């Protein structure tokens, strides 16, 4: 009957070793979960950041082309305009000749 | 000793019970975990085709840009040139 207790104590000792690491174990996925969600949610901020940044970036740009595609348009009309001034000049001038 | 038995006995109980629930808890974090990890890759793969996707929208706007610029720079002169050609004529003409 006191040979119960010391299988009893021997078997505790193991038992009580074994859940340490079963809980050690999980302990360190717990730490693994979190740093990965930790983590996730990190980058869906940065990529709400990323997103507005590149779309505030890209309206620029569009702003740019525009523009500098409404002047281009223009001026390229004045030239040919002016060219053809020119051109009904000389025309004149050698038909009076 | 039925009194420190009878104890002995409900604390091994309780160390088999409770590494069970721990394996069981190990079982659903490893399972969360692999979830957890593909939204993870999910995530950074989004990203990194949205940059892509963007740094090249980027790429021709500028190269338009750029060419626009060279362009209008070029007959913004010759324009501006040949406004002067006329210019020049016609005050000879007025000396004439």
């Not at 104590?9 to 050690?24: H, P």
């Given at each position: 009957?006191?040979?119960?207790?010391?299988?009893?104590?021997?078997?505790?000792?193991?038992?009580?070793?074994?859940?340490?690491?079963?809980?050690?174990?999980?302990?360190?996925?717990?730490?693994?979960?979190?740093?990965?969600?930790?983590?996730?949610?990190?980058?869906?901020?940065?990529?709400?950041?990323?997103?507005?940044?590149?779309?505030?970036?890209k309206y620029t740009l569009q702003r740019e082309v525009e523009?500098?595609?409404?002047?281009?348009?223009?001026?390229?009309?004045?030239?040919?305009?002016?060219?053809?001034?020119?051109?009904?000049?000389?025309?004149?001038?050698?038909?009076?000749?």
């Amino acid at each position: 009957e006191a040979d119960i207790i010391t299988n009893l104590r021997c078997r505790l000792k193991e038992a009580e070793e074994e859940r340490l690491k079963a809980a050690q174990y999980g302990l360190q996925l717990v730490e693994s979960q979190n740093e990965l969600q930790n983590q996730l949610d990190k980058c869906r901020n940065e990529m709400m950041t990323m997103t507005e940044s590149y779309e505030q970036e890209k309206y620029t740009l569009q702003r740019e082309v525009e523009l500098k595609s409404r002047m281009l348009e223009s001026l390229s009309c004045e030239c040919e305009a002016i060219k053809q001034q020119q051109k009904m000049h000389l025309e004149k001038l050698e038909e009076q000749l």
